[PDB]
Amino acid sequence: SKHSYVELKDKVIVPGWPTLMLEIDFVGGTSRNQFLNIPFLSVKEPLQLPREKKLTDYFTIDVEPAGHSLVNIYFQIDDFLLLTLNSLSVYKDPIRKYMFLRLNKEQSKHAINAAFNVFSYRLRNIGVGPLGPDIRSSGP
Amino acid sequence: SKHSYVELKDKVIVPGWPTLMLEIDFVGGTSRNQFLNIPFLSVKEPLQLPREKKLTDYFTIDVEPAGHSLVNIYFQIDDFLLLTLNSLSVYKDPIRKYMFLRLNKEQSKHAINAAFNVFSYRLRNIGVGPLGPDIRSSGP
Amino acid sequence: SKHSYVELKDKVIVPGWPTLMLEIDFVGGTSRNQFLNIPFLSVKEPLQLPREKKLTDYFTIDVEPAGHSLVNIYFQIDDFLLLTLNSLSVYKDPIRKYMFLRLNKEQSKHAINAAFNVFSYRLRNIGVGPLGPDIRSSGP
Amino acid sequence: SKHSYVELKDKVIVPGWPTLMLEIDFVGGTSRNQFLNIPFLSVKEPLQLPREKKLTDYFTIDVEPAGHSLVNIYFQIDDFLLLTLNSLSVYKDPIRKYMFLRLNKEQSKHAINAAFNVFSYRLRNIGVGPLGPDIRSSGP
Ligand SMILES: Nc1ccn([C@@H]2O[C@H](COP(=O)(O)O)[C@@H](O)[C@H]2O)c(=O)n1
Ligand SMILES: Nc1ccn([C@@H]2O[C@H](COP(=O)(O)O)[C@@H](O)[C@H]2O)c(=O)n1
Ligand SMILES: Nc1ccn([C@@H]2O[C@H](COP(=O)(O)O)[C@@H](O)[C@H]2O)c(=O)n1
Ligand SMILES: Nc1ccn([C@@H]2O[C@H](COP(=O)(O)O)[C@@H](O)[C@H]2O)c(=O)n1
């Protein structure tokens, strides 16, 4: 049936927790040319998909223009990954099957200069900094 | 008689449809130096002007400063091209004879650093992404 | 006596008229490193100071931080130059003896990365574009 | 006990006074790769810590993501340094033990592209410009 692509807001990123970086390469290969690194989600446990399976099997993305300078990235997340991410997530199950996040002027120019052509993309686990635990517990 | 240069707003760009990229080269030649790629218009069918005719015959542009950091690009569109674009357009005939679009801080610095001197410019057809059709139909 | 550095706003830049570009070089020499090109003023006639005299004799600038990311450029304009600019100006005599203009996030990073050290600076005349005269007369 | 990381706002930077630049290097070494230079504090006297002691002994920082594009830098300042900075500060003792400052879109991309990994960081004294004294005294 019909759906809507819901927005993955910034609140899903919590300072002090490890992060899942969405890394995108465009026209070339290994940092060959245009790319984007995007803090995607704050997590409790690091993501580690099954041996066999590829991220491409559960994750599909589409970089699209949203104006003369801004760009959005659309997401289609498979149940397995949706379930996975929601259990790792620091923020209460924010992930859905159809999403998108807005890029800023700076991030968008890279997408635009590559005519939105995605070569490869992955989700990398980024550890916490020296004040990480102190930061998240020292709320107001 | 007198006219006004009307603004080509972002609403004319619809995520999920193919796009017409406005590509601009400045002082050098083939990406020799400063350049700009600008999502110009969302289209149903790709643009493909007549054999002979050159884009320069129907299209004239002028990059001008609009402040100490922002720049605007002015357009003068010939009837043939105005008619063409309006029929391809996803958004209801937004194109007029005299227009202009605002560049953002990021895009403007390139224009400024080349003292607004346009060497060449074209309109390229950009295809749709993997979720393209699903994106435009999955409205709210 | 006491004064205030007044702001040189964007309204002094009028699309369609020739411009005076404020060019700044920082730590190195000929585009050796960090630099800034800033549309400074819209003019009717191009600036052309006396044979002998140097711009440095009438113009003094100071790049200063205004926050953790924004920077301002302060100006001290000599009577001769103040008088000159005000007569060339498209906007009604906006120039004063003590001024400053705000840089945007993008422009500021270059100033910041050079620790505000100005090596050289000049005012260059920038001609008008192909639609220049039509642009300024085709007001609303 | 519990605390909050207070924000080091821009008001602590006063145009016309010397500055303390927070310089950060990320994954590589000597400007090897990603870095950040941040106007940190306006001071009356330049900072000059004891012979032996290292800045790392009184200062600890943590670069953390705060959204899909913005980043914050968290600080933990030791009493010695807190006392030092507050006496040099042009703005009335703004420094506290636990702080953080927001980075802008432009500054954040560098932090993000290095996955927030800090290699080294220091506080450099930046002198005043040619109109420095005139600027701070020529208030409104
Ligand atoms: N977020 C970023 C930052 C840089 N880049 C790439 O790095 C090149 C150099 O830009 P930097 O000055 O940011 O290192 C760019 O022209 C672009 O190919 C990118 O594609 N995405
Ligand atoms: N939109 C853009 C992006 C990059 N560029 C060119 O690419 C060079 C490298 O910038 P990037 O880091 O964006 O690749 C710039 O100095 C400029 O000549 C441009 O002219 N317009
Ligand atoms: N407005 C600008 C644009 C570029 N630059 C210089 O050009 C270098 C390459 O940046 P671009 O990608 O903008 O060409 C920068 O690292 C900087 O030294 C500058 O100093 N001021
Ligand atoms: N504030 C800045 C400016 C530049 N840079 C570095 O300088 C490289 C070239 O960027 P510029 O065009 O700004 O000189 C960047 O790819 C990045 O490695 C940085 O890391 N932080």
Structural domain harbouring B14? 1-140
Determine what percent of chain A falls in helix, strand and coil, rounding each to the nearest 5.
25, 30, 45
* Residue in this structure with the two tokens 């991220």, named with its chain if needed: A55
B62 is in an annotated binding site: yes
Q: Cβ A40–D118 below 8 Å, yes or no?
A: no
Which residues in chain A have Cβ-Cβ distances shorter than 8 Å to D61?
130-131
For ligand 3, mutation pick of C35, C38, C103 (most atoms within 8 Å of CB): C35
Q: What residues contact A129, with CB distance under 8 A and at least 6 apart?
A: A135, D62, D63, D64, D74, D116, D118
For ligand 4, mutation pick of D25, D27, D110, D112 (most atoms within 8 Å of CB): D110
Task: Say which DSSP state C45 is in.
Answer: S
Measured in whole angstroms, the distance separating CA A90 from the mean position of its chain's CA atoms is 14
Resolution, in Å, please?
Answer: 2.7
Q: Is D101 on the interface with C (CB under 8 A)?
A: yes
Measured in whole angstroms, the distance separating CA B31 from the mean position of its chain's CA atoms is 18
A115 is in an annotated binding site: yes
Quote the Cα angle for A46-A104-D7, to 5°: 70
Q: Is C73 helix (H, G, I), strand (E, B) or coil?
A: strand
Rama region for D131: left / alpha / beta (φ>0; ψ in -120 to 50; rest): alpha
Measured in whole angstroms, the distance separating CA D43 from the mean position of its chain's CA atoms is 12
Exposed, middle or buried, A11 (CB in 10 Å: 0-12/13-18/19+)? exposed
Q: What are phi and psi of C50, to 5 degrees?
A: -55, 155
Q: Strand pairing of C71-77 and C98-102?
A: antiparallel
In angstroms, what CA-CA distances link C105 with D17, D23, D26? Answer: 21, 18, 21
CB-CB neighbours of A45 under 10 Å: 11
The strand pairing partners of C21, in sequence order, are C39, C124
Q: Strand pairing of B71-77 and D120-126?
A: unpaired
> Rounded to an integer, what distance in angstroms lies between the CA atom of residue D137 and that of residue C64?
14
Q: What residues contact D26, with CB distance under 8 A and at least 6 apart?
A: D33, D34, D35, D36, D110, D111, D114, D117, D118, D119
In angstroms, what CA-CA distances link A54 with A92, B41, B140? Answer: 26, 35, 31
In angstroms, what CA-CA distances link B103 with A73, B34, C106, C119, C133? Answer: 21, 15, 14, 30, 21
> Rounded to an integer, what distance in angstroms lies between the CA atom of residue A79 and that of residue A102?
23
Q: What total number of domains does chain D contain?
A: 1
The strand pairing partners of B101, in sequence order, are B73
**In CATH, what number is assigned to the domain containing residue D37?**
2.70.20.40
Query: Which tokens in the block code for residue C69?
Result: 């990311």
* Residue in this structure with the two tokens 């999502």, named with its chain if needed: B39
Residue type, position D135, single letter: I
> Rounded to an integer, what distance in angstroms lies between the CA atom of residue D52 and that of residue C2?
45
Q: What residues contact B3, with CB distance under 8 A and at least 6 apart?
A: B97, B98, C138
The dihedral through the CA atoms of D31, D34, D39, D43 has a sign that is negative
Which residues in chain A have Cβ-Cβ distances shorter than 8 Å to B37?
112-113, 115
Q: Which method resolved this structure?
A: X-ray
Cα(B34) to ligand 2 centroid in Å equals 7
The dihedral through the CA atoms of A107, B115, C116, C10 has a sign that is negative
